[PDB]
């Protein structure tokens, strides 16, 4: 599951 | 993920990509090819699906054999290699080894990942987010995958629903009597 959450978190971390 | 071709065989089954019994696992699998077990032969193991296009991307590898009908029925080579040596297009990497009989070990290099790579490229200079639409559509695709995982979890729970009752109940032999009865009437008549 973690990769989908990491996508969102990364889009936030950008 | 990775796509290629394995280019030999050793026993119908041989030692796995790894094991939790000494570190962590990687698939035990087999390609059935057979030959003599104390003097010369040089067989092969094959697939489209074994040399698949999906894969655990990389490892500093250990080569171990096993099995070999019953004449061999056991290991036959031990070897190691950091995998950059076996480059992805035409880029042969090779051995000769012989833990019980000689074999000139031949393997061919004839023909989340993307996400992590992109991060590195992003970090490599002064850069923007540009066409973030791409990320939106991707998260939607992630969601379709996540749905599927949840569906699998539902099926996981569904699997035990009837199994309790099925484990719970025997009537079984009840059927055979009525079956014999149906036959017997007709035969007798």
């Amino acid at each position: 599951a973690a990769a989908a959450a990491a996508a969102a978190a990364a889009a936030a971390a950008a | 993920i990775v796509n290629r071709n394995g280019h030999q065989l050793l026993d119908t089954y041989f030692t796995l990509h790894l094991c939790s019994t000494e570190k962590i696992y990687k698939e035990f699998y087999r390609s059935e090819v057979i030959k003599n077990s104390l003097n010369p032969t040089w067989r092969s193991l094959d697939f489209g699906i074994m040399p698949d296009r999906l894969d655990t991307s990389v490892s500093c590898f250990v080569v171990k054999i096993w099995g070999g009908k019953e004449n061999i029925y056991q290991l036959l080579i031990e070897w190691k290699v950091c995998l950059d040596g076996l480059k992805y297009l035409g880029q042969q990497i090779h051995a000769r080894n012989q833990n019980e009989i000689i074999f000139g070990l031949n393997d061919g290099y004839y023909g989340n990942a993307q996400k992590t790579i992109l991060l590195q490229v992003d970090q490599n200079c002064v850069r923007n987010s540009y066409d973030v639409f791409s990320l939106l559509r991707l998260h939607r695709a992630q969601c379709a995958i996540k749905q599927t995982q949840v569906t699998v979890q539902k099926i996981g729970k569904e699997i035990e629903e009837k199994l309790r009752l099925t484990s719970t109940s025997n009537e079984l032999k009840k059927k055979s009597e009525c079956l014999q009865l149906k036959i017997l009437v007709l035969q007798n008549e």
């Binding site: - | 066409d131 559509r137 695709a141 379709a144 749905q147 569906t151 539902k154 629903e161 009597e177 014999q180």
Partner: protein
């Protein structure tokens, strides 16, 4: 490593096309494939309809019959008479 930078320059100089297609086709070719994902989600919806149907039918099955252990007694009765019929 290094030769991939030279191939980037070759894509720009000869093509122009190839290096500019890679980002665009990242969605564009993908879009062709996204239909399949969607269809399989449509498929997944149907799968759920069966899960849903079972999440009624199993419970209904339990609630409908709710009979067991009687069969052994009635079967023993049947057996002694049935074995008599086949013996006769």
């Amino acid at each position: 490593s290094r030769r991939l930078k030279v191939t980037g320059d070759l894509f720009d100089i000869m093509s122009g096309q190839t290096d500019v297609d890679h980002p665009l086709c990242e969605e564009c070719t993908d879009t062709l494939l996204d239909q399949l994902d969607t269809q399989l989600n449509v498929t997944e919806n149907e799968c759920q309809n069966y899960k849903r149907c079972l999440e009624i039918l199993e419970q209904m099955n339990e609630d409908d019959s709710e009979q067991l252990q009687m069969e052994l007694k009635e079967l023993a009765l049947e057996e002694e008479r049935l074995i008599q019929e086949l013996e006769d």
